[PDB]
Copies of this chain bind each other. A is one copy, B any other.
């Protein structure tokens, strides 16, 4: 039995940029051609608690990361092409 101390938990759960898995379809729903391999990507995005419900965990600095994704025409063609995805370099607890 091991107990993570209050202040350890509060600190590591606090609003920060964290490796987050994001479905490529949910990101780009306008997609009527290609099934994606991988189906999802690991993106550094904001996430975590904020001290009081008044504040929300929001990104202060944003940017794109570029990844070789396999685009599959399920019956027809299939190739590796690059796709950009939003990522969050820095985050904050800001009032809603």
Q: Which residue of B lies closest to A10 (CB)?
A: B38
Q: 6 closest pairs, A vs B, by CB?
A: A39-B49, A6-B68, A38-B49, A13-B38, A40-B49, A4-B67
Interface residue tally for chain A (C-beta within 8 Å): 35
**B contact residues around A65 at 8 Å (CB):** 2, 4
Cα A79 to Cα B67 with chains together (Å)? 46
User: In the bound complex, do residue A13 and residue B42 qualify as a contact, i.e. CB atoms below 8 Å apart?
Assistant: yes
Which residues of the other chain, B, contact A10 by a CB distance below 8 angstroms? 37-38, 70
Q: Is A27 located at the chain interface by the 8 A CB criterion?
A: no
- Given A6-B80, A19-B18: A51 and B37 interface contact (C-beta under 8 Å): yes
- Can you sample 6 A-B contacts with CB below 8 Å? A8-B68, A13-B41, A18-B19, A37-B49, A37-B51, A38-B48
- A21 cross-chain contacts in B, Cβ below 8 A: 13, 18, 47-49
